[PDB]
Structure formats: structure tokens, C-alpha cells
Design an enzyme around this catalytic site. Structure first.
Site, PDB file in Angstrom:
ATOM      1  N   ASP A 281     -37.993  33.699  51.360  1.00 39.00           N
ATOM      2  CA  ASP A 281     -38.096  32.774  50.514  1.00 39.00           C
ATOM      3  C   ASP A 281     -38.566  33.360  49.287  1.00 39.00           C
ATOM      4  OD1 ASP A 281     -38.870  30.635  49.025  1.00 39.00           O
ATOM      5  OD2 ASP A 281     -40.277  29.730  50.411  1.00 39.00           O
ATOM      6  N   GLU A 299     -35.758  28.887  46.359  1.00 35.60           N
ATOM      7  CA  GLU A 299     -36.831  28.242  47.279  1.00 35.60           C
ATOM      8  C   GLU A 299     -36.634  26.803  47.650  1.00 35.60           C
ATOM      9  OE1 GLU A 299     -41.088  28.137  46.397  1.00 35.60           O
ATOM     10  OE2 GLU A 299     -41.525  28.572  48.452  1.00 35.60           O
ATOM     11  N   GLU A 300     -36.404  25.989  46.642  1.00 31.95           N
ATOM     12  CA  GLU A 300     -36.314  24.561  46.543  1.00 31.95           C
ATOM     13  C   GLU A 300     -35.114  24.265  47.327  1.00 31.95           C
ATOM     14  OE1 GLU A 300     -36.707  25.856  43.414  1.00 31.95           O
ATOM     15  OE2 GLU A 300     -38.770  25.186  42.929  1.00 31.95           O
ATOM     16  N   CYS A 416     -37.158  38.358  40.020  1.00 34.72           N
ATOM     17  CA  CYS A 416     -36.427  38.763  38.859  1.00 34.72           C
ATOM     18  C   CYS A 416     -35.957  37.703  37.674  1.00 34.72           C
ATOM     19  CB  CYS A 416     -35.476  39.938  39.416  1.00 34.72           C
ATOM     20  SG  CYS A 416     -36.385  41.198  40.148  1.00 34.72           S
TER      21      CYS A 416
END
EC number: 3.2.1.143
Length: 508
Positions: A281, A299-300, A416
């Protein structure tokens, strides 16, 4: 045309459950909180809570439960009794839900906007879907929320900075906790000038209801998919949340460990094609990031399609530089298309993953937060190279587990793009960290075929020339000292990979 993937064939990489250690019996210890009856834990059966009846701890070492007798409101009365009365009302219109939530959140009556919830209910959903939501889903959610003290009988410890501790609870326990989060019942987790919980992520779902973003309806659809599944068919598995905090790291300059295997590809996904592997994650240091607010990137999205991840925000303090959170056993309830502004809930997912001997699905996810680089060259400073190496290493290392029992790491471009990280440096950093933790690497470049080729070419070069972790690290130092340290432009004239090739080809 470019190949779709390069390196070791993905089927030769290690994955769960096949590679896994023989687990000892699950039991509570000083390092492991277990909130269920392990003696009656059985495949395909809802775990029983331990202890049998609710025990409250209202202190700075545990979650402050909404059902606590010390959860008081204005004389001083019982906030839990008020929550029960507020939520045991018929819902037919979105305002009814708003008014219920605000009965025990009076201080936020002006601050919490419910425009997104209202628009979702009234405009996005078709009439039949809306009816189902208020006639069945919402009442069923209320039922599991108000059953919290009977479902979650054991105080839940906070996973604070520096703790190496695990909490294992049932998916059913998590469902009850997250229904409470939906109805915004967790005390002391709302104030902007809060003290005790200022270092914890948001847990209450209030920001999912606010504003006009077209993202909110998609988040609500994804979450209601979950709540529908768990209320219609109770989940039977367990989930482990583990905070890992390392004080000591490899002496990178002298590390003699060889590079490990690489599979690298511009197609596929971590969650889809890294099944049974350690899945990264790309975290915020507040784990889950803006899941309960405005964020909708890697992530979300993961936190919405496997929503049991969200409960980590209840008890996981912000990560320090040397820390990570490892979550084993979360289930995928939704499928999606797109990303960020194009993210859409696609349909329900029926997770077919096998479970380990503790009834945890063979899905392991690790939250590691990259640094944000607002000045590009900062990331080549040795101290910042080491910070990222150590962060990744903490995410990958499993103290006391043989290397042959460790799955490959399934990762990609960490920190990134707009966060400022250089993909080619960051890929090498993860390869080195994985090498140090003695795990193989499966790397997803998400459509960037040139990047795939460059990563494979560099790994191949370093591997064939038998450069160990320390040798590669010393080349990064060389790049810093020779091309970055005195660079008056935003980026150096010579890139990292070209510099490494020429450095090695000009060497002994």
C-alpha cells in the site's frame, strides 16, 4: 513491440498459502491481542468473542469505545443511550439519517455538511435501490452497530509509535466497529484541536457525506456494497493488524546480500495479479490517507474495496520513519474501474481466497509511506536514500521467518509522479530493500513499458555483474557525490541508470 513482462516467470515466485510457515496455535500474549475464542474457532463459522461479556477500558492505552459507561454527554448523561435512541428510528429520507447522527454530535451540526449523502440517496440511486438502503441496509447496519458491546467485548489497544504489537479480531467485529464509524459514534475523534487523537487518522465517516464531488457517490456505493454483504451474510474469518517498528537497519554500505529475483510488467495490478504476495500500500503516514475524506488514489481505493482495512485508523497512530502496518486477512468486497476522478464502483466481488490456519484470508497488505519530495534532488541525498531503504525494509522484513517461507513482494512506483519520487531510483531502492529482507520482487509499472524495460535491464546488469546490496548502494553514493551534490539545476545532466552503467563498465 515491447514484451508484456520481463524477468522471472511470475508462477515461479513464492506466494501464500503454499509458501507459508506452519502456524503455531493462535493465543493471546504480551505481543498479541486476540479478541476471539480460539478454542472454538472453526472454518466457516462466525468466531465467538472473548471475553464472553463486555469489559470497558477508558484510558490512554485503548480505544475509547462509544458503548463505554464513561462516554458522557450533557446533567451528565449516557452518550451510548442517546446513540441507541437516535439510531433506532425509521429512516425514509436522507435528512432523517443526518438528524440521527447529529443528535449525539451537536457541536458539529453546522460543520458537517451532508450534501453528498443527500444527493446519493435522492438522485444517484434509483428508487428501488434507495428503498432497499433505508428499509434494510441502514436498519441492519444499526443493529450490528448497537450490538458493539456484545460483539467487541475486549478492549482494543492503541498501536502507538514504537510498539511491536499485533491485534487479531474477527471480520464480524470489524463490521460492527465500521458501522459505528459510519454513524460517527466514536468519541474524541472529531475536534480539530483534539489532543489525544491528533496523531491518529480520522475514523468517523462524516467527510464521506459532505460537498459536491462526484467521487463521494462512488465511495458510498463501494462502502454500501460491503455493508450489504456483511449484514446479509456474516463474515467468518479473522484479520491481524501488526505494527512493526525497527530500531536497527542493515549497514547498507557493507551489506553482502545478493539481489533477488525480479518479475516486472506494465500490465496487471497489485491486488489482481499479486494474489498471495506481500502487497504494498503506497501509504500516507496516517494509514488509509484520505479514504474517509477526499482522497481516491492507490491507498484509498484499496481501503474502499477491502474496507476492513479502514478499521486500522481506529487504533493505528501515525507512522514514524521506521514503522509500518501489516494487515493479513482482509477480504475484497468490490470491484472498480478507473482511478481518482474516473474511479467508479463496478460491481460486488466474491473473494475466493483460501484461508490460513487462523482463518485469515491469504491476503497480506503492508502500508509504507514514501517521503514527498518537493525539491527533486533531495531524494538522492544519502540520508534520504537510506530513509526510503529503511522504510521499505521495515515493510518487507519478517523477523524469525525463513526466507523460503516468504512470498514475493508485489509493488510498483511508490511515491512517484506528483509526490515527487523518481521511479527509477525508487525501483532500485525497493529491489535493494527486498534483497536485504531476502524476498523476491514483482514490480508493476502500470502502463509504462519503457520503465519496465529499464528496470529489468538494470536488475539484469547488476545481477550478472554480481554486485551485492553494498556495491549498488556505493554506486548511489557515487551518483550523489559526483552529479547531484553540486548540481545548480533541478536535475543532473546525467541520469542515474546511465551513470551506473558507465561507472561499472569503466571499473575493475
Amino acid at each position: 513491440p515491447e514484451k508484456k513482462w520481463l524477468g522471472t516467470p511470475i508462477e515461479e515466485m513464492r506466494k501464500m498459502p503454499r509458501c507459508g510457515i506452519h502456524l503455531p496455535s493462535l493465543r493471546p500474549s504480551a505481543s498479541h491481542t486476540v479478541t476471539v475464542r480460539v478454542d472454538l474457532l472453526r472454518a466457516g463459522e462466525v468466531p465467538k468473542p472473548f471475553p464472553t461479556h463486555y469489559k470497558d477500558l477508558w484510558d490512554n492505552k485503548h480505544v475509547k469505545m462509544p458503548c463505554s459507561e464513561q462516554n458522557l454527554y450533557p446533567t451528565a448523561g449516557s452518550r451510548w443511550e442517546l446513540i441507541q435512541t437516535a439510531l433506532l428510528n425509521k429512516f425514509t429520507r436522507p435528512q432523517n439519517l443526518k438528524d440521527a447522527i447529529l443528535k449525539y454530535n451537536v457541536a458539529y451540526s453546522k460543520k458537517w455538511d451532508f450534501t453528498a449523502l443527500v444527493d446519493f440517496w435522492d438522485k444517484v440511486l434509483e428508487e428501488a435501490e434507495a428503498q432497499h438502503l433505508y428499509q434494510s441496509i441502514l436498519p441492519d447496519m444499526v443493529k450490528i452497530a448497537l450490538c458493539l458491546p456484545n460483539i467487541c467485548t475486549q478492549p482494543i489497544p492503541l498501536l502507538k509509535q514504537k510498539m511491536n504489537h499485533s491485534v487479531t479480531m474477527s471480520q464480524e467485529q470489524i463490521a460492527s466497529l465500521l458501522a459505528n464509524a459510519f454513524f460517527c459514534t466514536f468519541p474524541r475523534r472529531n475536534a480539530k484541536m483534539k489532543s489525544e487523537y491528533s496523531s491518529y487518522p480520522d475514523i468517523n465517516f462524516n467527510r464521506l457525506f459532505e460537498g459536491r464531488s462526484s467521487r463521494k457517490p462512488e465511495k458510498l456505493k463501494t462502502l454500501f456494497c460491503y455493508f450489504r454483504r456483511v449484514t446479509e451474510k456474516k463474515p467468518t474469518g479473522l484479520v491481524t493488524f501488526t505494527r512493526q517498528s525497527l530500531e536497527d537497519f542493515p549497514e547498507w554500505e557493507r551489506c553482502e546480500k545478493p539481489l533477488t529475483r525480479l518479475h516486472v510488467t506494465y500490465e496487471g495490478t497489485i491486488e489482481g495479479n499479486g494474489r498471495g504476495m506481500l502487497q504494498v500500500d503506497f501509504a500516507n503516514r496516517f494509514v488509509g490517507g484520505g479514504v474517509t475524506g477526499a482522497g481516491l488514489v492507490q491507498e484509498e481505493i484499496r481501503f474502499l474495496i477491502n474496507p476492513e482495512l479502514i478499521v486500522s485508523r481506529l487504533f493505528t497512530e501515525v507512522l514514524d520513519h521506521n514503522e509500518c502496518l501489516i494487515i493479513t486477512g482482509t477480504e475484497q468486497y468490490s470491484e472498480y474501474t478507473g482511478y481518482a476522478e474516473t474511479y467508479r464502483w463496478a460491481r460486488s466481488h466474491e473473494d475466493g481466497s483460501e484461508k490460513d490456519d487462523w482463518q485469515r484470508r491469504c491476503t497480506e497488505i503492508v502500508a509504507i509511506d514514501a517521503l514527498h519530495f518537493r525539491r527533486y534532488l533531495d531524494q538522492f541525498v544519502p540520508e534520504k536514500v537510506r530513509r526510503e531503504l529503511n522504510k521499505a525494509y521495515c515493510g518487507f522484513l519478517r523477523p524469525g521467518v525463513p526466507s523460503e517461507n516468504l512470498s514475493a513482494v508485489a509493488t510498483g512506483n511508490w511515491g512517484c509522479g506528483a509526490f515527487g519520487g523518481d521511479a527509477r531510483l525508487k525501483a532500485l531502492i525497493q529491489i535493494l530493500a527486498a534483497a536485504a529482507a531476502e524476498r523476491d520482487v514483482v514490480y508493476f509499472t502500470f502502463g509504462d513499458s519503457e520503465l519496465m524495460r529499464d528496470i529489468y535491464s538494470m536488475h539484469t546488469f547488476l545481477t550478472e555483474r554480481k554486485l551485492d546490496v553494498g556495491k549498488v548502494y556505493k554506486l548511489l553514493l557515487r551518483y550523489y557525490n559526483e552529479e547531484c551534490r553540486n548540481c545548480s539545476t533541478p536535475g543532473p545532466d546525467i541520469k542515474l541508470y546511465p551513470f551506473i552503467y558507465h561507472a561499472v563498465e569503466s571499473s575493475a
